């Protein structure tokens, strides 16, 4: 479930910069991880989330007590959040680079309540600037971060 | 001034000989210096007529005039070691011409290069010519098959040659050709697909048995 | 004038390249056929290399 | 001294100059500075001067590259984007590569371009490759065709013999001889 | 008199001097300062030298290189754009290190270029290589044609002797007296 | 005083002194602050010296390291770009500890680099490296590549004698005397 | 009296004097201010001097550690990039620690370098060591190598005494007399 | 304006013979010393006429005339390490010449080389000329196979060979060729890997090659 | 001023000959000398002819003009201990030169080196050539394997030999090359590695290697 976490945490960055959150103190993040369900469901899929199992059993075969190799474990987290930040690198810049934009027009005008402009202009922008890079951009990294089974090897180690 | 001091520095390159019909005839060894006394002769610094002739093409322009008066003529190639008595190598088990017939031929051979004194023609042997060529396909270890028919041979290199052996053949060919001339035998070097280079086998009840050589070729998985 | 060229064999693979000069064919068991061998071989007397092999390697065969 | 182009450069006149000097009329190369050279022609050359232009369809456009197509300067690139601009440098390398072989005047070498496999599960096709040549006269072109095979088959991923297709020809006759004025 | 090249750069102008010096044409390299060089001809040669011009296809393009097209200023840096720059230092730096070899002069080496084989699970391909290179006269040069197989085999990470097609030639005659001027 | 180059640094003009000075001409090296060096040879030398110019491929290059092409003042590097800098520094440093032995005057030496070990869970594969040497003359040269292949083998992971290949050669024949200005 | 170099620094022209006065050719150092260094020698020995800086690669560049690579001033340091720094200063306290001994006038010392057992599960593997030294003469080089190999086998985990190589010879004869002006 | 002192300082590698034609001739050794000679007749400081000469130059100019006029020749090489008396190696138990020819040959080759005072011709056996090479090819323990035919043998040198095998015997054929010539015995030193490159084969007049645990393939008997 | 002043201030290293030819010759006794007095002679503060000979290079110019002249010759080395007696090393069991055929070749080597007054041809025997390098190498302790032949024979050493033993060879057949040289007796040192490290194996007559439980090796016999 690596490619689907990471597009998932991606939708869930690009819903909370926009404002539309902030209730806690989501539809967007479920609609990138469905998407990135079916572009890897499409060109192969279900053969190669098959043959990490068919290997599973080539190298962890019972009665010899696998682990799934401790020390490796512990970069997980980070391994899919360097991940998700890059992959939302682009929009949550344009986002912050007009918000101090508008910042200095409330330095320029002082009763503008510019805090009320900013929901009704970064949904606008938090849509277009990620149009552009949604076709060309988004869907190779959804076929680069699946998981293949060379490395089953490098997550594993029997026990006698 | 002269032609002769007209061209480079070096008088070793060139040779001036003086024509019958009032030319005067620069005989050079290769391409790359028969432009340039063609170029000296083109931009017309010099007041009289000249021409400049060569080896690979002075061959070429004499068999237009024969295959056109001498049809069904077996000959080779013309050598030009010294330019003012140059040799006719013609082939002898292959030609019925009388000693009074083949002294029209010399001079009529004689007309066509008006440089030239006399052509000495003389006869060469047909089995020295595929001897030579057999002895030195076989000396470079390169896998061949001879094909003779009547009136000529040919040699077939197929395979996928290695990068030797395609140094050591293509060293060798216009070695043979600047001798005897691609009239009488004729190599077919050619690469294709097949780590059996040439040869070709068919497997039945006895063993092995060697096909006919034949222009469809197995392609090789391996 | 014969012989075996053996790169990382199985056991079955290489037993059946000798079922021609042994004049029988040869039938290999599945417990038998894990083991593997390398090397020039030369079948020239597969009467007696049979009998060798069956003792270096640990085997037991009957006709 | 009647003009019949201008505003061209300086690969485009050294161009229409030599076809016109094979052709037996003379030509005069006016420069012009920023606005670029000029071509005039004789007044009883000029009807045959227009024809030659006609028919070997000068000025010529200058050369395509498909990497050109795909500027690197975009903000952002497509994978198809970056495969047809690896490929386009790599033809134009192994055509600057072959002009240094023995007698080999110019050369010209095409590769099959990939697209539809990169994306899908279909695995990827056979490449195919194609070249021309023009070879210095008196050389035996019969024999010259094996070499620049070999030297073409494993400059590549995977390819055969029969996949690749060599053209070439001897170059032209010298022209060395000047045209001549028009006397009247 | 007539000019036929201007603005050239300094290794553009050396190789028309020295494609023309070959043909018996006299030139001259006339500097003009920020503009580059300039190259003229005498008055009877010009008509030949537009024929040089067309058929060595002068003035020479620079020669371009595969990390040209992959710039390192973009912030963003795919695999597809730092595997192309990887190869395209090694065959660099394989190619001046032939040089250094025993009588050669000159050298080029090409890469078998494989990108897309690392993001599906497909296993890479074998690496293919090839060469061209010029020695000196006077040398064997069908015996040293296994020393570069040699050294150019395990500087790879697992090639074969298939893969490495080398050919190669000797120099041409050399030119070393002068052209001569055309009197009238 | 034809000029044939001119810019050039100091590494730039030796090398192009050094290639004049074995075919029998001299040549002059006149500064120019900070427009580098430039090159002068007389009139009966200028047809030669232009034509071994485009034969040796004068003016050299800079020579072109791995590590160039992957700058250390990025902002972020990945693994990629980390073992390509580790690897250019580790053949910088064995050729110069190479100069250190007895005899030799130059070496070169070449490592396979690991591309799809960077993003893959395979196991990297057995590097090969790969040398050459120039040695001086009148030593026993057959019985000097044991040496280095012993010093080469554990200087990695896990190398064998057949990945290790050396190809050495012996240095050229000395120059001596003064090439002779000529007279007319 | 032409000058062959400048701008070169103070560790630089020791070695170009001490290379020119092994073969009997004069030299001057010259300085310039913060401009560097310069030589000069004779104009008949001007011709040998542009060889021997041909032949021998002079002037000699900075000696390249792998601590270069990776420099501390980086806001980020990933373990790739410390055991790196930590490899190439164990390699320099080992080399200014072999000179200490005996007869050794210089030395250089190769640890092999793991960065990639790190991350994964496999166990590392043993690591290899490298040596090469130069002894005065007048000493029994054959015996003196045992002790090496006894201070550098336990200088780290575990290491086979067949994993270390040492290769070392005695020096060249030593210069000491003048090289002499040519006489005019 | 003499010619010993337009050369280098060291009047040790040049050597000026005076031709019978009004030529002088300095013969060089290598082909450095040829261009270092060559550069000073071309700029042209020498009024009178002059060529230089060599030995691998000069011994493939007078292997074209005895191409065209006396074919079918057994001859190894023509060395001239005294350029006054030259010595011609001709092979013995190859050719039919009688006593008497062997003297216009002797003078067609003095008129040929005109620094040549007189040219003489010794006799060399056939047998002598293989056993060297191959008691040479046995010191440096190389593996090879020698193939035996008319009129020139051949030494083939295939396999994986390592890096100290192929210097030592790259350091053996070019001191072989510059005694003997490349004339009757020839080396072939071909590099290439396992072929069949890890496959099963069983060979021998019924081969078969194994592609699979399940796959066979007959091509040509193995 | 006279020769042997213009080299350097050592005036033992150099040892300038008159010789026969109206020249003088200077003989040197390494590359790193010979290049220094090829310095002087080169830039040209000398006004008569001179040279600059070697022991090296002088063995190898009279065995080039020996092998046009005199073909199928058994000789190892020409000696220049004192270069104007030089001692030539002739084999015994190899040739069969009389008496009066040997005083046309060692007056016709007399014309060939101008420096020299006599050439004193000895006849060594070809036993001992190949009986002090076995006994020379074995007392390095090294394994090797001597393949005998017909004119010369052949030392081969292979094996992964540890760096003592790749030290004591050079410094045994460095030694060895410059008094015989290797004309009759060469060695062949080729280093590979073993394939028997945490391998089991059976050794004797029907040798083999287990390189796996489960995997048999039988090599060529």
Partial sequence: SWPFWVMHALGCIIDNQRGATLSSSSEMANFLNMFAAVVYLQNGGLVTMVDVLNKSYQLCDPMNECTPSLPPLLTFINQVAQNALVLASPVVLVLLLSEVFLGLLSRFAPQMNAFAISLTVKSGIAVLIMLLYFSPVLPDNVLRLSFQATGLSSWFYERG | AELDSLLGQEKERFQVLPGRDKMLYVAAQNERDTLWARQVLARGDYDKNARVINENEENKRISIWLDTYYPQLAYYRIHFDEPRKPVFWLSRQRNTMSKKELEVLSQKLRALMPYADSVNITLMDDVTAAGQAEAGLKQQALPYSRRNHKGGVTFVIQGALDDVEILRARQFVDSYYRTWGGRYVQFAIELKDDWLKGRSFQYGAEGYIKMSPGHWYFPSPL | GSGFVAKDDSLRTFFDAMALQLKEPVIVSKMAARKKITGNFEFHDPNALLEKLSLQLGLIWYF | ?184
């Fill in chain 4, 1 to 184: 001294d009647k003009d019949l182009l201008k505003g061209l450069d300086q690969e485009q006149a050294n161009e229409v100059i030599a076809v016109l000097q094979m052709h037996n009329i003379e030509a005069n190369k006016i420069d012009s500075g920023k606005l670029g050279y000029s071509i005039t022609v004789a007044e009883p050359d000029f009807t045959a001067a227009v024809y030659w232009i006609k028919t070997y369809q000068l000025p010529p456009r200058p050369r395509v590259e498909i990497a050109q197509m795909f500027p690197a300067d975009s903000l952002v690139s497509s994978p198809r984007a970056e495969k047809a601009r690896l490929y386009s440098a790599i033809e134009q390398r192994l055509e600057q590569s072959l002009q240094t072989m023995e007698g080999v005047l110019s050369a010209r070498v095409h590769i099959s371009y990939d697209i539809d496999a990169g994306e899908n599960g279909r695995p990827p096709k056979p490449v195919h490759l194609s070249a021309l040549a023009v070879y210095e006269r008196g050389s035996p072109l019969a024999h010259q065709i094996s070499d620049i095979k070999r030297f073409l088959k494993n400059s590549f991923a995977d390819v055969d013999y029969d996949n690749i297709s060599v053209v070439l020809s001897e170059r032209s006759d010298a022209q060395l001889q000047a045209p001549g004025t028009p006397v009247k």
